[PDB]
């Protein structure tokens, strides 16, 4: 016989689209790659247990091509599957409230996410893909599966993959409004004609090489091309935060001196991030785990500091 239920496809889960689907044929046969709340259903045949429901689909047509662009800000042919494949595990994670931040209960090596995520609920960033806008907001409200799958999709990391906090933040920064952000640097050797540079946007809020912000304020000897070693020093900073990164190295975090940091313990192959946040005292957040002390020595990779406006006084 002939049987057909009605369902809606969507790329953004806001704009729906009426379809009537033949209950013999798989969704793969009708819409192509299709997903139900993360589940690949391309090869399942429609249950009447599905009438009224929203499947995500690959952006096959132009209507879809434009909704997906406007919501996500990408045209990566693969973005959508990546986002559903990741959502299909993120939906099953636990996002506990830990000291009033949303964290993630450790699974599938999401250590780097929990710390990235905890960093966000802590610094002033505004996302440009409405997708992130929307998903972040639920995440703050402690509903974070979507935000997580979204980060996975924007980073081309699949659930399980080993990820790096720095690179992760590079990706989210790319999709965040930091135009007004402005860094001016100068690098002086003792006998050179000391060259200066100006950095704008993301390039202005990330530095790789030292954890210490005040250190960078005072000068950092760098592998320069002079006759001696040259000091790199920060001339001017315009931004709502800065991020200092560097390879994992034993470092001490002092209450009241930073906003937060990332500890990486292990090696390239095997290791674990943790997040330290400066509040009434030092709190160390490790997924669902919480500990406290007053001072913290340990192998740090990333330290973030609140900022707005800084002129150096060094001549
Ligand atoms: C709302 C809004 C907005 C503006 N916008 C648009 N469009 C395209 C058509 C649809 C319409 N929504 C406007 N696409 C965008 C952005 C945007 O801000 N960022 C973040 C970004 N990206 C980069 C590369 C940055 C670089 C430096 C500083 C900040 C930056 N911020 C993006 O990544 N993409 C892809």
Swiss-Prot record:
Substitution effect: residue 77 to S: In strain: Omicron/BA.2.75
Reaction(s) catalysed (UniProt annotation): Thiol-dependent hydrolysis of ester, thioester, amide, peptide and isopeptide bonds formed by the C-terminal Gly of ubiquitin (a 76-residue protein attached to proteins as an intracellular targeting signal)
Binding site for Zn(2+) 6: 189, 192, 224, 226
Ranges of residues in domain Ubiquitin-like: 2-57
Membrane topology value: Multi-pass membrane protein
Localization, UniProt: Host endoplasmic reticulum membrane
Activity regulation, short description: Inhibited in vitro by GRL-0617.
Catalytic residue positions: 111, 272, 286
Effect of residue 75 to A: Partial loss of ubiquitin cleavage in vitro; no effect on ISG15 cleavage in vitro
LRR repeats: 117-139
Self-association and partners: May form homohexamers. Interacts with N protein.
Function text: Responsible for the cleavages located at the N-terminus of the replicase polyprotein. Participates together with nsp4 in the assembly of virally-induced cytoplasmic double-membrane vesicles necessary for viral replication. Antagonizes innate immune induction of type I interferon by blocking the phosphorylation, dimerization and subsequent nuclear translocation of host IRF3. Also prevents host NF-kappa-B signaling. In addition, PL-PRO possesses a deubiquitinating/deISGylating activity and processes both 'Lys-48'- and 'Lys-63'-linked polyubiquitin chains from cellular substrates.
Protein name, UniProt field: Papain-like protease nsp3
Organism: Severe acute respiratory syndrome coronavirus 2 (2019-nCoV)
UniProt lineage: Viruses, Riboviria, Orthornavirae, Pisuviricota, Pisoniviricetes
């Amino acid at each position: 016989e002939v049987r057909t239920i009605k369902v809606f496809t969507t790329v953004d889960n806001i704009n729906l689209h009426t379809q009537v689907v033949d209950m013999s044929m798989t969704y793969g046969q009708q819409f192509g790659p299709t997903y139900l709340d993360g589940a690949d259903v391309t090869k399942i045949k429609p249950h009447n247990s599905h009438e009224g429901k929203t499947f995500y689909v690959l952006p096959n047509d132009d209507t879809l091509r434009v909704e997906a662009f406007e919501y996500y800000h990408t045209t990566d042919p693969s973005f959508l599957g990546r986002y559903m494949s990741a959502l299909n595990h993120t939906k099953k994670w636990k996002y506990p409230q830990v000291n009033g931040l949303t964290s993630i209960k450790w699974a599938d090596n999401n250590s780097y996410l929990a710390t990235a995520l905890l960093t966000l609920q802590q610094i002033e960033l505004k996302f440009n893909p409405p997708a992130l806008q929307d998903a972040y907001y639920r995440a703050r409200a402690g509903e974070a599966a979507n935000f997580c799958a979204l980060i996975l999709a924007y980073c081309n990391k699949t659930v399980g993959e080993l990820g790096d906090v720095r690179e992760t933040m590079s990706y989210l920064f790319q999709h965040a409004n930091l135009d007004s952000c402005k860094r001016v640097l100068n690098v002086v050797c003792k006998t050179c004609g000391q060259q200066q540079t100006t950095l704008k946007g993301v390039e202005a809020v990330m530095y790789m090489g030292t954890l210490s912000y005040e250190q960078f304020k005072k000068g950092v000897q760098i592998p320069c091309t002079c006759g001696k070693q040259a000091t790199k020093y920060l001339v001017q900073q315009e931004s709502p935060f800065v991020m200092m990164s560097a390879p994992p190295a034993q470092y001490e975090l002092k209450h009241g001196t930073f906003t937060c940091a990332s500890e990486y313990t292990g090696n390239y192959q095997c290791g674990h991030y943790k997040h330290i946040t400066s509040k009434e005292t030092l709190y160390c957040i490790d997924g669902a785990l919480l500990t406290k002390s007053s001072e913290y020595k340990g192998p740090i990779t990333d330290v973030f500091y609140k900022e707005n406006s800084y002129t150096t006084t060094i001549k």
